[PDB]
Design a protein around this ligand. Structure first.
Ligand SMILES: [Cl-]
Length: 162
């Protein structure tokens, strides 16, 4: 198991424009297109992202390419962020994948807002961090995916994904 397989399980794969759990226009492996309610603004972003006239449909390779970019952007955003970087550097490899997962889903800003939980992860107080992470909108809205991520932080193994 690795970050790519983990995120592919959590996000799934759709080759046609769809709406996410928040109701936003998305495509591929969790690639957010726009928060705008316009399906046209969505198609326009999509064509911009792919570099061709897509009419809302992409191929598997195209989905995979967006996915490579998104993962790369996520890690990098973590490494340039004063609140995230110290937590990331402190963790083992499996738990690093859990943090990349949260950032891919909610963005750097959202994650940087879990101040108390990050402080608990740095200290390696696993059980305590798991309880604090669950007191969030994130956990209440996407509880099955949140439990998987939280279990990963708690255990430092890929058990929740096997
Ligand atoms: Cl893009």
């Amino acid at each position: 198991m690795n970050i790519f397989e983990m995120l592919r399980i959590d996000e799934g794969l759709r080759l046609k424009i769809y709406k996410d759990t928040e109701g936003y226009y998305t495509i591929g492996i969790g690639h957010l297109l726009t928060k705008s309610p316009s399906l046209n603004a969505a198609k326009s972003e999509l064509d911009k992202a792919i570099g061709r006239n897509t009419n809302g449909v992409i191929t598997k390779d195209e989905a995979e390419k967006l996915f490579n970019q998104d993962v790369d952007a996520a890690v990098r955003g973590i490494l340039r962020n004063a609140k995230l970087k110290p937590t990331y550097d402190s963790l083992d490899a499996v738990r690093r994948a859990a943090l990349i997962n949260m950032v891919f889903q909610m963005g750097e800003t959202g994650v940087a807002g879990f101040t108390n939980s990050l402080r608990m992860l740095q200290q390696k107080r696993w059980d305590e961090a798991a309880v604090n992470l669950a007191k969030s909108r994130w956990y209440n809205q996407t509880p099955n995916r949140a439990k998987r991520v939280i279990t990963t932080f708690r255990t430092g193994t890929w058990d929740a994904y096997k």
